[PDB]
Symmetry: D2
Subunit: 727 residues, 4 copies
C-alpha cells in the first residue's frame, strides 16, 4: 500500500465547506478545534489510526489480513486461526436492539447558554447564570420506522436533548408537536402497536396509512388533536432545523424558596419553520431516504449550525384550574395567545459525532432524568414514561451500567454504593458498598436540599383520593383543540391537511373505518369533514351535517402561532439552489448568481446531464456536482437556469422534468435569457407569473426577487395551477 | 453523620501487616505505592469516595437515601421515584453468568521478569531482555464448583496468568497437574457433565465423589492419569502459593530464524510444595470455605508475595517421536528425569485488586491469546480449546467488546477495523472501517513477520492425511503414566492416594461402578488395587491378580519430581502458628516464641476461650485474635502452648480438642512447662515422641526444633498412631 | 457398547424407597404415576432418551461422538466440524445469572387444597372449594450465598410457593421468620450489600459473621428483630420440612361484597419444628454442603412428603 | 447466540426440527426441553449409553465426513488458481 492519491484529494479539508464540496468526515477530523467540556472528556476513549499497525483486539500485530489459515493454499480452514475468529466474532455481534420507538434518528453535539439568571423561578444550576455554558447532545428522530427506514416520512418527530449540567444530566425528551396522541401511558403499547407495521406481515414501514392506525384513531377520539398535526405539513418537515420542539407535559420549576411554577418547554427554530409538501416528501423517501440525516450533518460541516431558542410557558400554581382544559392532559396544548412563551436561552449544534453507532446509536435519554430545580406533575402519560426508559435501556444497551457508555456519562462527579452489573467499567475503591457505614466514615454522603449544590427533594404536592384505575373526567373533551388547530391554519395549510387525511384513509382497506374517521372529523369541523368525505366518495348524513362544533378554547377562535406560515419567519441561510448548466454557460449570469447566493449564505449545486466538467463562455471550467437525475429537484429549495447554449438542454427530458417537479412542489424558479424557453414546459404565461423570476440576464434585481421568493419558502399561490401539470 | 470511631481504628494501616492484625482492604488503599504499568493504566477508571456527595448514576445529589417517595408517610410508593428505581434496578442486574468451569477463583496483580534473554529460542518480546518487566494478573481456581463453592475441596486447580506484553496479551492458562483427564476437546462437555453436580438434583457441589464421575472414569481409561493426581494430596493443596502449575500442552517457541522448538510450560512455587490431608481439607470447607482466597489475600497484605519460577521443558523438532508416548497427548506428562525444566524467569504477586467483581469476576483469559514467538501444536485437546474461550466470553461478559473491560485491556496499542457491538467504549475516528482502503491511506496497516515488532505468522507445519474423526493410535495407552506417578510417591503419599479412591468410591451408590474402577486400578498396580478393594470389601479375582503391569516410561521406574515431599522444598515464611493462651501466660515463653517466629517470617494467632484480652504474668496486655472454636487448628500449620496458669484451660473441651485435631492432621505441636499436661490428651509417651516439641520453658532449642518440624510441613511418621485417636 | 450391568442394578426401582437404598433419579422416572395438572402439562416438553439415536440439535445423527474432525489422525482440527462446534457452543453457553439473593435453593412439585370454602372473606378461586386442588411448585432457599454455596449455614431461609390457579398464578413469596431486617425497599441494596461477601475480596460466603453486616446492624436498630431470629437456632434448621414459613407483610383478602380484611400468611410444618446446633451445622457445611437439598429430595423419594398447613 | 439470546435457538418454534433430536446438551438461557435422561454424558452405564451413536450407512445412518485428502503447510495464503 499507498492507496491514497498523491494529490491528497482523498481527505476533506478541516474547515467549513458547503454541502457537496468535499467528502463528509468524523467531526473530530473535520472540525478539530470545535470543543466543549463533553467533547473534551470523550477524548480518553477516542481512537486514531494513522501510522498505527493493524492488530487483534489483544494488541497482536497482523501480518496477512487477506487470508484465513489453511492446510495447503487450497485446503480447509483451520480451527487454530484465532485472528480470523476474533475478526469474524466481533463482526457477528455488531448489532444491538434498535429503540422500540424512535429507532430512526440523527444526532449532533452542541452547547446551551441561558439569556439571564432564572434563579427567581428555578434553582436549576444550568439556568442560573448566562455565562454558564452547558454541553448538549441532541438526537432528532421519527417515531414509527426502524433504524433503516426513511427520513422524510409523514410522522411525528422526536427532539431529545441531553444537558450535561454541573449538578447532573437533565434529558429534555420532546417531539415536534405540542401534544401527544393519548392520555394515559397504559395505552402506549396499544397506540404504538396500532401505528407500527401490522403483525401478520410487518407492513407498512414508516407510515400510519394503514387500517390498524385509523381503526385505533376512530375508536379513541383523544388521538384526534395529534392526528391533526400529523396530517398537516407539520408531519413532513423540510429539516430538523426548521421544526419546533416541545416537552409536551406540564412539569414544575422549583426555586430556592420552594415555590413551584408549572412550565411547558419549547424550542423555537432560529432557521424558521418550514415543511415539504406530501408528493415531494414521499418521492424523497425513495430518491434519498437519508435526506434529513445528511442535511443536518452537512449544515454543521458548512457552519449553518442548527440553533434553537429555549422557551418556557409559565403558569402559577393558583392558575391550575383556570383553563377550559386540564393542564395535566397531554392531548391539550396551551395556546400562546393565553400563555406566551418566555425566551430563556439558546442552544447551538456545532459538531457532528465521530462514530454514529458509538455516540448516536448507544445514546440513552430519559424524561425521568431531572435535576434539583425541576420536578414532575401528575400528567398520567408522563407518569408512565418515568418507568419505561430505564427498563428499555437494560436490554437495549445490555445492562445497568449504560451510564458508563462514553456518550451517556455525566461530566460532573457521581459516587454511590451501586456495584457490579454486566460490563462494569468503574473500579470502586470504597471499603463500603452500603450506607450507613462506619468503615468509610459514611462517604459518599447524602446532602440536604438547598439553594444550590443540594440534594434532590420532591416538591411536597398534596395527594388525596382513592386507589383507582380511572380517567379524570376533566380529560374527556376531544374536539375543541383539533378545531382551534384547524381554524388557525392558512387556506393552503387546511388543504394540505384535507389531502393528508384523504390520502391516508384511501389506503385503509376496510371502508367502515374511513367512514368512522369521517364521522369524527364531522365533530371537529364540517368543512374539513365534507372535503375529506368528498375525496373518499362518502356522503355525510343529515345528522352529521347538524353536529354542533365544539366550543372555542377560552374564547379563542384561532392562534396564529399554530400555523407554520401565517406569520413570516423565513431564513434563507443554509438553503440550497440547483443551477442547471449547459455546455456554454454565460459566465456573467453565473457570477451574478453565485455572488448573490453567497451574500445570503445560500448554497448552490451545479447540475448537468453527465459528470466531469463543462467550460463556460469565458473559458471558466465548471465542475459538475451531480446529474439532473442524480440530484432531483426534491433535494433543493429553488431552481435557477442561467443563459448560454440552451439548445444543449432544451430537449433533455430530465432537464424539463426537473423544472416540472420543482414547479409542482411550489418552489421558486428563475430563468435567465434564453432559459425562458423553458416557460413552455411549465405552461407559464407570456407575461409572467408570481413565483417565476425571468429577465434578459441574471442581473441586479433578478437575484433579489429570487431570494425574496426563497425567504417565503414556497409559492402557495401556484396551488390551483399545479393540478393540471402531468408531473 | 458520624460514623467512624474518633480513634481512627476503622481504617487499616497502609503498610504490610500480618494476617488478622487489621481489617483487609482494597489493594490501592492498602498498598498505594505498589505500582506496575497495568496498575497505573487502571487509574483512569478507579473511583474514590471520601468527601464526595452521594448521587444517582447521572450525577444528581441524593438528599434522603433512607426512604422511598410515597403519598403520605404511610402511603403507597410512587412511580415517579426515579432515585429508588435506578438504585433497585442496578441492584436487580448485578449478576452475570459465572464461568462454565473454574467459576471459583481468587486473583492478584504482580509482575514477571526473565532471568536472561531467550532470543536464541523465541522472538517473544516479553522474554527478550532481563530488564524488561511484564505486568501480570493471575487467577487461581478450582474446576467443578460454582463461584460460591468452597476453596479446600478435592479437585484440580486452575492457574491462569495474563501477561500484559508490549506486543500483545499472552494468556498462559494452566492447571496444577501436568496432564488433563481427556484427550480430545470433543469429549470436554461429556467429562465436565460427569464431574459436575448430577442433572436431576444438582448434587454434589465441589466433589468428584459421586456415581457419574466414576462411571465416566471406569469407561474412559484415558482419565486415569489425572485421576491419580486428583486422588493424591495434590488435589488438596495447602495454598495457591504451595502448588505447581503447568501449561499441560506441548506448544512451540519460534525464534527469529524461524526455528520451532517444542515447549511445555511450568511454574515452580518458591514457597515449596505443600498439601493438606483429606480430613482437614473436608472439615475446612465447612469451618472456612474461603480459606485459600483469604490466605492469598493476606499473604500479599503481609508482604509474603506469592513467587513462582517460570520453567521450560524444551524438545527439539527432531526428537518428536523419540518417547514411548506421544508429545501431543495431554494425558501424558514429560518426565523431568528425561527432559529437565530449564529456569526462565520469576513472577511475583504483590497487590490485591480493588474490586473483586470488576477485576477478578470479569477477567477473561484464553489459551489462544499468544504473541509472535509462540505457536500452537496439533494436541487435539488444545485445538478445541482455541474455539471455546472466545465463544463463552460473548455470553458471560455480554458481547464482543470484553477486551475493553478495564482488567482485560492490553497496555500496548491496539487498532483495527472492528466496530460496534454491545457496550462499545472505543470511539473510532478512522474514516475507513475496512481494508484495503485509500481514504485513510490504508491505516492501520499490516506488518510483515520479523525478529521484533513484526506481524504474527503461523509456523508452516506440514499437514498430511485424510479428513477423519479418529483418535491417533499413539494415544491409545492409559496405564503406564498412572503407574509411573504411583511408584514415584512416598509410602505415606501412596496411602493418601489409596484413601482418596476409597473415600470417593464409597460415595458411589451403584456397586458395579466401584468394581469397574477397581478393575482399572488392577491394570496400573496390584498393590494399589488390592488396598482400595480391601477398603471397599471387594476381592480381586485370579485374572485381576495376574494382569501384567504396564511397562516403565522410557525405562524409568520412578521420578521423584512427581512427589510433593520426596525431595525437601519446605519454606516456613508465611506459615502461621496457633498459640493457645491461658489467663496468666509466662511472658518469657511468649517473647521467646514470638521473636523466633518473627525471625523466620512465621505468623502467630493468639487464641483463647473468649475475645478481648488477657494479662501476662508481668502485666503485658495480650489482645486475643480468636477463640479456640472460632479459629480451628485446621487454619494453622502448627500449635504452641506456652506455660502460665495451665489449670485455666486444662479442662477446656475446645482447648483439648484443638490439640487432638492438630495432632490427627500431623501438625507439629510444642508444649512448654506445665503445658506438657496436655500430653495426656494426645496420649503421648512420657519419654516424648518425634513431632512433639517439649521442654521446661520455651527457650533456646525449643523454637529451633519447632521450626525444623515446620520446615518439613507435617509429621508423616505419626500416621500409624493417629488411627486410634477419636478426633 | 456398553452397558448397564446385566443385573439391571444401574436403575432405581420406580417405587418409594428409603434414603440411600437406591440411586436417586428424575421424578418422572422415580414416580411415573404421581400426577397433577401442572406436572401433566409439562409433558409436552419432556424428553426421553432410551432407544433414541444421538443427534445434533438439528436432528442429524452422529456417527462418532468421541473425536473432532482433523486433517489426518494426528492433524489440526478443521473449522468444518459443525458437530463439534454445536456441541462445545451449547456447553459454552450453559450458565445464566444466578438470583441476586436466594441463589442457593431446592425445589419440588406438589398440590394444595383448602379445608373449607373461604368465600366469606375472599373471592380468591383457589380458596373457594375444599375439593378444588391447586398444583404448586415450591422453592426453598438460603439468602446470602451463591447457587454453589452450602445448605446448613446460619442465614434466613426463603420459602416460595407458586400456586397454579384457575384464575392466574399466585406466588406466595415468604421466608422462615415472620419479619424482615429492614423497613423500606430503598434500603434493600444497602442491607444486602452489607450481608453479602465484602466487595474488595469477595469474602465471606454464606455468612453474616463479618464486619460489614454488623456495622450495618449497629447503625440500623430496625434490623435487630430479624437479627435475633437469625442468631437463634431458627437460623440453622434441620430440614426445609421442619421450619415455619411466613409471608411477612400484611396483605389483604377481598370478598365478593368488596370487604377488605388484613391478612398475614403462615405455613405450619406438619413434620414439626426442629433445628441443628451451631457446631453441627457449621461442620455439616463441609461434610455435606448439599444436606438440605439431598434430604428434601430423598424424603420425597421415600414417601415422607413435606406437608405444611 | 446474541441475535436469538442463547444456544437454545433450535427450540424457537419456527426453527425446530420435525424429526427426533436427543443428545447430552443441557441448560442455556431459555431452556424449553426438560430432559429425563439420568445421564448428561457419554459414554454412560446409568442409562445404558442412550441416546446412542449410529454408524454411517445407506439410510438413517450417522454423519461421517467424506475422507478428502489434505496435504500442505499451515499457510495464510490465497491459491494462485484464484488469481
Ligand atoms: C409526550 C409523550 C412522549 C414523547 C414526547 C416521547 C419522546 C420520545 C423520544 C424523543 C424518544 C427517542 C429518544 C432518543 O432519541 O433516543 C423516545 C423514546 C422512547 N419512548 Fe418516549 N415519548 C413519549 C411517550 C412515551 C411513553 C408514554 C412511553 C411508554 C410508557 C414511551 C417509551 C419510550 C421508549 C421505551 C423509548 C425508547 C428509549 C430507548 O431505547 O432509549 N414514550 N420517546
Ligand atoms: C489442558 C486442558 C485445560 C486447561 C489447563 C484449562 C484451564 C482453564 C482455566 C485455568 C480456566 C479458568 C480461567 C480463569 O481463571 O478465568 C479455564 C476456563 C475455561 N475452560 Fe479451560 N482448561 C482446559 C481444557 C479446556 C477445554 C478442552 C475446553 C473446551 C473445549 C475448556 C473450556 C473452558 C471454558 C469455556 C472456560 C471458561 C472461560 C471463561 O468463561 O472465560 N477448557 N480453563
Ligand atoms: C419480606 C421481605 C422479603 C421476602 C420474604 C423475600 C423473599 C424472597 C424469596 C423467598 C426469594 C427467592 C424466590 C425463589 O426461590 O426463586 C426472593 C428473591 C428475590 N428478592 Fe425478595 N424477599 C423480600 C424482600 C425483598 C426486597 C425488599 C427486594 C427488593 C426491593 C427483593 C428482591 C428480590 C429479588 C431481586 C429476588 C430474585 C428473584 C429472581 O431472580 O427471580 N426482595 N425474595
Amino acid at each position: 500500500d499507498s492507496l491514497a492519491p498523491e494529490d491528497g484529494s482523498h481527505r476533506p479539508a478541516a474547515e467549513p465547506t458547503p454541502p457537496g464540496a468535499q467528502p463528509t468526515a468524523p467531526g473530530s477530523l473535520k472540525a478539530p478545534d470545535t470543543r466543549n467540556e463533553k467533547l473534551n472528556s470523550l477524548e480518553d476513549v477516542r481512537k486514531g489510526s494513522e501510522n498505527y499497525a493493524l492488530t487483534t483486539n489483544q494488541g497482536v500485530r497482523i501480518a496477512d489480513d487477506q487470508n484465513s489459515l489453511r492446510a495447503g493454499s487450497r485446503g480447509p480452514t483451520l480451527l487454530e486461526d484465532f485472528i480470523l475468529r476474533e475478526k469474524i466474532t466481533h463482526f457477528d455481534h455488531e448489532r444491538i436492539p434498535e429503540r422500540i420507538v424512535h429507532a430512526r434518528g440523527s444526532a449532533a453535539h452542541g452547547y446551551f447558554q441561558p439569556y439571564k439568571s432564572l434563579s427567581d423561578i428555578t434553582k436549576a444550576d444550568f439556568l442560573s447564570d448566562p455565562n454558564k455554558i452547558t454541553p448538549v447532545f441532541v438526537r432528532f428522530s421519527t417515531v414509527q420506522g426502524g433504524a433503516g427506514s426513511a427520513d422524510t416520512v409523514r410522522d411525528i418527530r422526536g427532539f431529545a436533548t441531553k444537558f450535561y449540567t454541573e449538578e447532573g444530566i437533565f434529558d429534555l425528551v420532546g417531539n415536534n408537536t405540542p401534544i401527544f396522541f393519548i392520555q394515559d401511558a397504559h395505552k402506549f403499547p396499544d397506540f404504538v402497536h396500532a401505528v407500527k407495521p401490522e403483525p401478520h406481515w410487518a407492513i407498512p414501514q414508516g407510515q400510519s396509512a394503514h387500517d390498524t392506525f385509523w381503526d385505533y384513531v376512530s375508536l379513541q377520539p383523544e388521538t384526534l388533536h395529534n392526528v391533526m398535526w400529523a396530517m398537516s405539513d407539520r408531519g413532513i418537515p423540510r429539516s430538523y432545523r426548521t421544526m419546533e420542539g416541545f416537552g409536551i407535559h406540564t412539569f414544575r420549576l422549583i426555586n430556592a424558596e420552594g415555590k413551584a411554577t408549572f412550565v411547558r418547554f419549547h424550542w423555537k427554530p432560529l432557521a424558521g419553520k418550514a415543511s415539504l409538501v406530501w408528493d415531494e416528501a414521499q418521492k424523497l423517501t425513495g430518491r434519498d431516504p437519508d435526506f434529513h440525516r445528511r442535511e443536518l450533518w452537512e449544515a454543521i460541516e458548512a457552519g449553518d449550525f442548527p440553533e434553537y431558542e429555549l422557551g418556557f410557558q409559565l403558569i402559577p400554581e393558583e392558575d391550575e384550574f383556570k383553563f377550559d382544559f386540564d393542564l395535566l392532559d397531554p392531548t391539550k396544548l396551551i395556546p400562546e395567545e393565553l400563555v406566551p412563551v418566555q425566551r430563556v436561552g439558546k442552544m447551538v449544534l456545532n459538531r457532528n459525532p465521530d462514530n454514529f453507532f458509538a455516540e448516536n446509536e448507544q445514546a440513552a435519554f430519559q424524561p425521568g432524568h431531572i435535576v434539583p430545580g425541576l420536578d414532575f406533575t401528575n400528567d398520567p402519560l408522563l407518569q408512565g414514561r418515568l418507568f419505561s426508559y430505564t427498563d428499555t435501556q437494560i436490554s437495549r444497551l445490555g445492562g445497568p451500567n449504560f451510564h458508563e457508555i462514553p456518550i451517556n456519562r455525566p461530566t460532573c462527579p457521581y459516587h454511590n454504593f451501586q456495584r457490579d452489573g454486566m460490563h462494569r467499567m468503574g473500579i470502586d475503591t470504597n471499603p463500603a458498598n452500603y450506607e450507613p457505614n462506619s468503615i468509610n466514615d459514611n462517604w459518599p454522603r447524602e446532602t440536604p436540599p438547598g439553594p444550590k449544590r443540594g440534594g434532590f427533594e420532591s416538591y411536597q404536592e398534596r395527594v388525596e383520593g382513592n386507589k383507582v384505575r380511572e380517567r379524570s373526567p376533566s380529560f374527556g373533551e376531544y374536539y375543541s383543540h383539533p378545531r382551534l388547530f384547524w381554524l388557525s391554519q392558512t387556506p393552503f395549510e387546511q388543504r394540505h391537511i384535507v389531502d393528508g387525511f384523504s390520502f391516508e384513509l384511501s389506503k385503509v382497506v376496510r371502508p367502515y373505518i374511513r367512514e368512522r374517521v369521517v364521522d369524527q372529523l364531522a365533530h371537529i369541523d364540517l368543512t374539513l369533514a365534507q372535503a375529506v368525505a368528498k375525496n373518499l366518495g362518502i356522503e355525510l348524513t343529515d345528522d352529521q351535517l347538524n353536529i354542533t362544533p365544539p366550543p372555542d378554547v377560552n374564547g379563542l377562535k384561532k392562534d396564529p402561532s399554530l400555523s407554520l406560515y401565517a406569520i413570516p419567519d423565513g431564513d434563507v441561510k443554509g438553503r440550497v439552489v440547483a443551477i442547471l448548466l449547459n455546455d456554454e454557460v454565460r459566465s456573467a449570469d453565473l457570477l451574478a448568481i453565485l455572488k448573490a447566493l453567497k451574500a445570503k449564505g445560500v448554497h448552490a449545486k451545479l447540475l448537468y446531464s453527465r459528470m466531469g466538467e463543462v467550460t463556460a463562455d469565458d473559458g471558466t471550467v465548471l465542475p459538475i456536482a451531480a446529474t439532473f437525475a442524480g440530484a432531483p429537484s426534491l433535494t433543493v429549495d429553488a431552481v435557477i437556469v442561467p443563459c448560454g447554449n440552451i439548445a444543449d438542454i432544451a430537449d433533455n427530458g430530465d432537464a424539463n422534468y426537473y423544472l416540472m417537479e420543482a414547479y409542482k412542489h411550489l418552489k421558486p424558479i428563475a430563468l435567465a435569457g434564453d432559459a425562458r424557453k423553458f416557460k413552455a414546459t411549465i405552461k407559464i404565461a407570456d407575461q409572467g407569473e408570481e413565483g417565476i423570476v425571468e429577465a434578459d440576464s441574471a442581473d441586479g434585481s433578478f437575484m433579489d426577487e429570487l431570494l425574496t421568493l426563497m425567504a417565503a419558502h414556497r409559492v402557495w399561490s401556484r396551488i390551483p395551477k399545479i393540478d393540471k401539470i402531468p408531473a
